Ligand binder design. Structure first.
Ligand code: HEM
Ligand SMILES: CC(C)CCC[C@@H](C)[C@H]1CC[C@H]2[C@@H]3CCC4=CC(=O)CC[C@]4(C)[C@H]3CC[C@]12C
Length: 431
């Protein structure tokens, strides 16, 4: 520090360091306050559970407007999360995939294929899945590239002090534009969409929304938007996913307005509130472990496949998904009852010491890397996984190309969420 100035790269950390030991008595998965604690507390809590109570029961976190809910069995081991994901006849995605349940009012907006089992779930998924296949994603690679390139160049041109928030200037707007363009949403409305999806998956964080009436107004507003755009596409076809939604028939039946709106919402919410956190956590990790940045930069194309997977394993942007038992089962000597909720902790599966060597090492060469960041596999395996991998790869490639020494200057402001491993802001600087 020879001169004081506006910033200083954040502290680095020793790669491979396990979290400080968290006593099992300190673990409060049913307290919102617990989810505000830093990753070291949270990661150490799940390490303790994997060792000492790998399946355990916790209460639902109550937020304003939430339906009173029974507790949930937390599956913290990789093998259990994998098994549960692969056996939906036992571990149903109905009636919901967060720990709390939907009100009847919310079902008008959130009753999509992600809270349905087969057969209906697969019939719905097939309406859009062609757009998400690798060969079709390849067609929009150039657009993903152009968006990332323009955003990083704008960071440089419009921040002459050479600092900016990575989330608002790259990590958020790159995946936002891509998924909204796939839906056919005009660019003028993308920021409106993003505000809505930020609220939908930010509820309970004071920086996003805590008033349930505001949450219900946002849900109604994005639903009305979806419906208005769908009515547009009913009269004038475009080559976008909203047109695919309104033109689809399942066994001779069009989708209802409810079904179209919830499908639209599912797609933009998932597209907007996942990859941005993989990217932001990735930049945080590069800032903490510069030897990993240096390695990747010296061989970007060679390491990119494994680097992208390790960023998803490290970030685990979706912390968990819920299921509901259709029958009694016993796992690890723990009897769970038909009708009980079960939570699949991907954040924990992705540190499981029985499955991953050196789990606390951010290793951009890690291979194989059978992480559960996109879920355990099975019927609901992330629809956007190919697209997310390309978004992540291109974001880091443009940072490497245009501002290779980009580094965080403050610790991230973390989203208060049990479900989404969100970073709200990440100030960065570059030369
Ligand atoms: C790094 C980024 C992402 C991560 C970590 C992620 C993670 C996940 C996870 C864990 C699931 C649940 C899987 C299961 O239950 O087995 C899921 C489902 C889903 N994701 Fe992704 N996701 C990401 C990006 C995206 C993107 C960009 C989209 C684009 C819209 C998307 C669309 C979907 C959809 C539609 C589903 C529901 C699939 C179904 O029910 O069949 N995801 N995702
Ligand atoms: C992260 C993606 C892969 C999946 C996105 C799923 C989105 C579209 C939907 C499906 C079920 C929805 C949840 C239903 C329960 C609920 C009730 C509330 O009062 C707050 C908002 C929440 C917590 C909803 C937030 C948005 C969810 C999670």
């Amino acid at each position: 520090h020879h001169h004081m100035g506006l910033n200083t790269a954040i502290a680095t950390r020793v790669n491979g360091t396990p979290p400080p030991e968290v006593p099992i008595a300190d673990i409060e998965l049913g307290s919102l306050d617990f989810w505000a604690l830093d990753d070291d507390v949270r990661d150490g809590a799940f390490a303790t559970l994997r060792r000492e109570a790998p399946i355990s029961f916790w209460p639902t976190i109550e937020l304003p407007g939430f339906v009173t809910g029974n507790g949930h069995w937390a599956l913290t081991k990789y093998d259990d999360v994998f098994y549960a994901s692969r056996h939906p006849d036992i571990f149903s995605s109905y009636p919901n995939i967060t720990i709390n349940d939907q009100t009847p009012e919310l079902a008008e907006y959130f009753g999509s294929m992600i809270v349905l089992d087969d057969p209906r779930h697969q019939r719905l998924r097939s309406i859009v899945s062609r757009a998400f296949t690798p060969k079709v994603v390849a067609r929009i690679e150039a657009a993903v590239r152009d968006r990332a390139h323009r955003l990083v160049s704008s960071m440089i041109a419009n921040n002459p002090d050479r600092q900016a928030d990575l989330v608002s200037e790259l990590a958020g707007p790159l995946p936002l534009q891509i998924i909204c363009d796939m839906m056919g949403i005009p660019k003028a409305d993308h920021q409106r969409i993003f505000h809505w999806t930020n609220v939908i998956l930010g509820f309970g964080d004071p920086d996003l929304a805590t008033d349930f009436d505001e949450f219900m107004q946002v849900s109604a507003d994005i639903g009305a938007y979806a419906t208005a755009l769908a009515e547009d596409r009913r009269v004038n076809h475009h080559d976008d996913l909203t047109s695919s939604l309104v033109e689809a028939e399942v066994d001779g039946e069009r989708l209802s307005s409810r079904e179209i709106a919830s499908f639209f919402i599912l797609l933009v919410v998932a597209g907007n509130e996942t990859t941005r956190n993989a990217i932001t956590h990735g930049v945080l990790a590069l800032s903490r472990y510069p030897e990993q940045r240096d390695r990747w930069w010296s061989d970007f194309d060679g390491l990119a496949p494994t680097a992208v997977e390790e960023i998803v394993r490290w970030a685990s942007p979706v912390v968990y998904m819920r299921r509901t038992l259709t029958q009694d089962i016993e796992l690890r000597g723990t009897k769970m009852a038909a009708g009980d909720k079960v939570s699949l902790w991907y954040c924990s599966a992705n540190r499981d010491e029985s499955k991953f060597a050196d789990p606390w090492t951010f290793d951009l060469a890690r291979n194989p890397n059978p992480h559960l960041g996109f879920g355990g596999g099975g019927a609901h395996f992330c629809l956007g996984a190919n697209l997310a991998r390309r978004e992540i790869r291109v974001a880091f490639d443009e940072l490497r190309r245009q501002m290779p020494d980009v580094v965080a200057t403050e610790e991230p402001a973390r989203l208060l969420s049990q479900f989404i491993h969100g970073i709200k802001t990440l100030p960065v600087t570059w030369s």
